[PDB]
Motif scaffolding. Structure first.
Motif, PDB file in Angstrom:
ATOM      1  N   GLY A  28       0.825  -1.199   0.000  1.00 40.17           N
ATOM      2  CA  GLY A  28       0.000   0.000   0.000  1.00 40.17           C
ATOM      3  C   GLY A  28       0.855   1.243   0.000  1.00 40.17           C
ATOM      4  O   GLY A  28       2.065   1.179   0.234  1.00 40.17           O
ATOM      5  N   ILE A  29       0.216   2.360  -0.324  1.00 40.97           N
ATOM      6  CA  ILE A  29       0.799   3.700  -0.147  1.00 40.97           C
ATOM      7  C   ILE A  29       0.333   4.169   1.229  1.00 40.97           C
ATOM      8  O   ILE A  29      -0.863   4.185   1.518  1.00 40.97           O
ATOM      9  CB  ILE A  29       0.457   4.712  -1.289  1.00 40.97           C
ATOM     10  CG1 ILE A  29       1.071   6.111  -1.024  1.00 40.97           C
ATOM     11  CG2 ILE A  29      -1.045   4.828  -1.563  1.00 40.97           C
ATOM     12  CD1 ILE A  29       2.553   6.214  -1.311  1.00 40.97           C
ATOM     13  N   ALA A  30       1.295   4.540   2.070  1.00 41.65           N
ATOM     14  CA  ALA A  30       1.026   4.967   3.434  1.00 41.65           C
ATOM     15  C   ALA A  30       0.367   6.346   3.453  1.00 41.65           C
ATOM     16  O   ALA A  30       0.496   7.121   2.493  1.00 41.65           O
ATOM     17  CB  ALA A  30       2.317   4.989   4.232  1.00 41.65           C
TER      18      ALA A  30
ATOM     19  N   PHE B 121       0.028   0.128  -6.467  1.00 38.82           N
ATOM     20  CA  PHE B 121      -0.288  -0.112  -5.060  1.00 38.82           C
ATOM     21  C   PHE B 121      -1.542  -0.984  -4.932  1.00 38.82           C
ATOM     22  O   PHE B 121      -2.538  -0.743  -5.610  1.00 38.82           O
ATOM     23  CB  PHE B 121      -0.481   1.210  -4.304  1.00 38.82           C
ATOM     24  CG  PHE B 121       0.793   1.977  -4.084  1.00 38.82           C
ATOM     25  CD1 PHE B 121       1.769   1.492  -3.198  1.00 38.82           C
ATOM     26  CD2 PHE B 121       1.027   3.196  -4.736  1.00 38.82           C
ATOM     27  CE1 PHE B 121       2.948   2.194  -2.981  1.00 38.82           C
ATOM     28  CE2 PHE B 121       2.209   3.900  -4.520  1.00 38.82           C
ATOM     29  CZ  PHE B 121       3.165   3.403  -3.631  1.00 38.82           C
ATOM     30  N   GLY B 122      -1.469  -2.014  -4.091  1.00 35.58           N
ATOM     31  CA  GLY B 122      -2.601  -2.907  -3.834  1.00 35.58           C
ATOM     32  C   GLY B 122      -3.723  -2.294  -3.010  1.00 35.58           C
ATOM     33  O   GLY B 122      -4.830  -2.823  -2.975  1.00 35.58           O
TER      34      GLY B 122
ATOM     35  N   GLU C 259     -14.060  -4.030  -5.217  1.00 42.28           N
ATOM     36  CA  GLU C 259     -14.527  -5.345  -5.709  1.00 42.28           C
ATOM     37  C   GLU C 259     -13.414  -6.117  -6.451  1.00 42.28           C
ATOM     38  O   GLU C 259     -13.281  -7.322  -6.260  1.00 42.28           O
ATOM     39  CB  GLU C 259     -15.768  -5.180  -6.610  1.00 42.28           C
ATOM     40  CG  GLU C 259     -16.565  -6.454  -6.894  1.00 42.28           C
ATOM     41  CD  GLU C 259     -17.560  -6.300  -8.044  1.00 42.28           C
ATOM     42  OE1 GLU C 259     -17.864  -7.321  -8.697  1.00 42.28           O
ATOM     43  OE2 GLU C 259     -18.039  -5.171  -8.311  1.00 42.28           O
ATOM     44  N   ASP C 260     -12.606  -5.408  -7.249  1.00 43.91           N
ATOM     45  CA  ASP C 260     -11.444  -5.977  -7.952  1.00 43.91           C
ATOM     46  C   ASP C 260     -10.162  -6.201  -7.092  1.00 43.91           C
ATOM     47  O   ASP C 260      -9.116  -6.539  -7.638  1.00 43.91           O
ATOM     48  CB  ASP C 260     -11.096  -5.105  -9.180  1.00 43.91           C
ATOM     49  CG  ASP C 260     -12.208  -5.071 -10.241  1.00 43.91           C
ATOM     50  OD1 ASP C 260     -13.284  -5.688 -10.062  1.00 43.91           O
ATOM     51  OD2 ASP C 260     -11.997  -4.391 -11.268  1.00 43.91           O
ATOM     52  N   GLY C 261     -10.239  -6.020  -5.774  1.00 51.69           N
ATOM     53  CA  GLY C 261      -9.111  -6.236  -4.865  1.00 51.69           C
ATOM     54  C   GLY C 261      -8.224  -5.026  -4.631  1.00 51.69           C
ATOM     55  O   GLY C 261      -7.060  -5.188  -4.287  1.00 51.69           O
ATOM     56  N   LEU C 262      -8.779  -3.814  -4.766  1.00 52.03           N
ATOM     57  CA  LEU C 262      -8.036  -2.563  -4.591  1.00 52.03           C
ATOM     58  C   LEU C 262      -8.756  -1.650  -3.583  1.00 52.03           C
ATOM     59  O   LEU C 262      -9.395  -0.668  -3.985  1.00 52.03           O
ATOM     60  CB  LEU C 262      -7.802  -1.894  -5.950  1.00 52.03           C
ATOM     61  CG  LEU C 262      -6.959  -2.684  -6.964  1.00 52.03           C
ATOM     62  CD1 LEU C 262      -6.978  -1.975  -8.314  1.00 52.03           C
ATOM     63  CD2 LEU C 262      -5.521  -2.883  -6.486  1.00 52.03           C
ATOM     64  N   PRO C 263      -8.661  -1.976  -2.263  1.00 50.62           N
ATOM     65  CA  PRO C 263      -9.363  -1.173  -1.253  1.00 50.62           C
ATOM     66  C   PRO C 263      -8.798   0.223  -0.976  1.00 50.62           C
ATOM     67  O   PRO C 263      -7.635   0.514  -1.288  1.00 50.62           O
ATOM     68  CB  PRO C 263      -9.278  -2.028   0.030  1.00 50.62           C
ATOM     69  CG  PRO C 263      -8.813  -3.356  -0.404  1.00 50.62           C
ATOM     70  CD  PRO C 263      -8.002  -3.135  -1.631  1.00 50.62           C
ATOM     71  N   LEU C 264      -9.648   1.042  -0.357  1.00 47.65           N
ATOM     72  CA  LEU C 264      -9.354   2.414   0.003  1.00 47.65           C
ATOM     73  C   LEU C 264      -9.444   2.544   1.500  1.00 47.65           C
ATOM     74  O   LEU C 264     -10.475   2.228   2.094  1.00 47.65           O
ATOM     75  CB  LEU C 264     -10.356   3.375  -0.644  1.00 47.65           C
ATOM     76  CG  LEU C 264     -10.216   4.878  -0.350  1.00 47.65           C
ATOM     77  CD1 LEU C 264      -8.873   5.428  -0.808  1.00 47.65           C
ATOM     78  CD2 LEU C 264     -11.361   5.637  -1.004  1.00 47.65           C
ATOM     79  N   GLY C 265      -8.365   3.036   2.099  1.00 50.08           N
ATOM     80  CA  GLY C 265      -8.344   3.425   3.493  1.00 50.08           C
ATOM     81  C   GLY C 265      -8.350   4.927   3.646  1.00 50.08           C
ATOM     82  O   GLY C 265      -7.900   5.664   2.757  1.00 50.08           O
TER      83      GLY C 265
END
Ligand SMILES: CCn1c(CO)nn(-c2nc(O[C@@H](C)C(F)(F)F)c(C(=O)Nc3c(C)cnc(OC)c3Cl)cc2F)c1=O
Ligand SMILES: Cc1cc2nc3c(=O)[nH]c(=O)nc-3n(C[C@H](O)[C@H](O)[C@H](O)COP(=O)(O)O)c2cc1C
Ligand SMILES: O=C(O)c1cc(=O)[nH]c(=O)[nH]1
Length: 358
Positions: free
Chosen positions: A65-67, A85-86, A145-151
């Motif tokens: 991920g990007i921190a 980035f995942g 949905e495609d495996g790329l979550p957002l925090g």
């Protein structure tokens, strides 16, 4: 490879040239702009199934991920996924807009592969970020949905009398738009932390099921043994979904050579790496391997990533490495991680999580 050659050109020539021509905050501001416009290569590193991780109620296509801190205001989320980035963590976002500290407030220590920052939670505010994420909400739903979550990392305003209410406001406004939320914790005491996190979780639980994010606690590496013992206990007690380990250090490890080493702020990059990995190790043991950890601090290679994973991290983040290596670092870390996983006999990332402890 073509990748290693490109990686060398950015690290050896392009980044040192660009960083010599620009103050560090302008470099950051330009990076956000170029990333927001998608000014990046297509995708030469297609992600292996080995890199897939399932954690925090979500698929992560890769664990790099990007921190928080690169994209404070959620301006460059799509470009960050394009970079490879995942997952993307935006923020910290404060309730009201605020300017942060006076400039200069970011400092490069190239001899140490480190940065010092004292941004002071400069933020466009929840309202601006909410509308910005709303504009691309369905694009994000597909990405998740495609495996790329957002925090989303939730901060508090400088002059806030009630820290828990600032975070609560953040849960209400941005929780519906996030896959996970992050609250930063500094040194506690234990009852105050329990109170704050209880309120955060109550507010999260009050959102409709479909728009209900995971809640994580992000810790600095500068906590006492008792702080860490207390945090672990509270996190397990309350059912906190995960830990982000670690933020920047207020310490200055012996051996820093950069002229700007005595600038006030948080130190990131290579000098933070092993302090961060040891904090992951400690938090994994104090939580019995049952609280997912995002490992962060000084990741610039597959080995750095794997050390954090083996210490207990389910996912990793980086930022500082991007300032010295540029966009190719993301592909570098992923390729090197995959190779090391194969070399150590792991089927994928999931098998390696906490392997040092077994
Ligand atoms: C800590 C603050 N800080 C610093 C200072 O410590 N640097 N920094 C970054 N700076 C970056 O580039 C600058 C040199 C820029 F002026 F070129 F924007 C990038 C970056 O990825 N730049 C890009 C992009 C996006 C696309 N294409 C490229 O080249 C074909 C490049 Cl070089 C990433 C960073 F984190 C950053 O956030
Ligand atoms: C310029 C800069 C700004 C940052 N801003 C934030 C922030 O707003 N919120 C946060 O939780 N962490 C922030 N961080 C900490 C990073 O998210 C990360 O925990 C830390 O830099 C260690 O990772 P690294 O060594 O890969 O950079 C920031 C770091 C840097 C270098
Ligand atoms: O905005 C900042 O100054 C900042 C926030 C944070 O959480 N970590 C950091 O190093 N800097």
């Amino acid at each position: 490879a073509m990748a290693t050659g490109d990686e060398r050109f950015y690290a050896e020539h392009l980044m040192p040239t660009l960083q010599g021509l620009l103050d560090p905050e302008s470099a950051h501001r330009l990076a956000v702009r170029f990333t927001s416009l998608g000014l990046l290569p297509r995708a030469r590193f297609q992600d292996s199934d080995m890199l897939e991780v399932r954690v925090l109620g979500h698929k992560f296509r890769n664990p790099v991920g990007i921190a928080a801190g690169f994209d404070k205001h959620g301006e460059a989320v799509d470009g960050l996924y394009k970079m490879g980035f995942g997952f993307v963590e935006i923020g910290s976002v404060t309730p009201k807009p605020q300017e942060g500290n006076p400039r200069p407030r970011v400092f490069r220590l190239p001899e140490d592969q480190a940065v010092i920052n004292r941004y002071g939670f400069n933020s466009h505010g929840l309202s601006v970020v909410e509308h910005r994420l709303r504009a691309r909400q369905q694009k994000q739903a597909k990405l998740t949905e495609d495996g790329l979550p957002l925090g989303v990392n939730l901060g508090k305003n400088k002059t806030s009398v009630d820290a828990a209410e600032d975070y609560a406001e953040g849960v209400r406004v941005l929780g519906p738009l996030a896959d996970y939320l992050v609250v930063n914790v500094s040194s506690p005491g234990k009852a105050e932390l329990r109170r704050l996190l209880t309120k955060v979780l109550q507010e999260r639980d009050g959102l409709r099921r479909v728009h209900r994010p995971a809640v994580l606690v992000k810790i600095a590496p500068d906590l006492t043994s008792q702080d860490k013992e207390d945090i672990a206990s509270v996190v397990k007690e309350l059912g906190i979904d995960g830990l982000i380990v670690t933020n920047t250090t207020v310490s200055r490890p012996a051996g820093l050579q950069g002229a700007l080493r005595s600038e006030t702020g948080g130190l990131s990059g290579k000098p933070l790496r092993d302090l961060s990995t040891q904090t992951i190790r400690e938090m994994y043991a104090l939580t019995q391997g049952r609280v997912p950890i995002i490992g962060v601090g000084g990741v610039s290679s597959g080995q750095d990533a794997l050390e954090k994973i083996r210490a207990g991290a389910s996912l990793v983040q980086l930022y500082t490495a991007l300032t010295f290596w540029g966009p190719p670092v993301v592909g570098k870390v992923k390729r090197e991680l995959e190779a090391l996983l194969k070399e150590q006999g792991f089927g994928g990332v999931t098998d390696a999580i906490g392997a040092d402890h077994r």
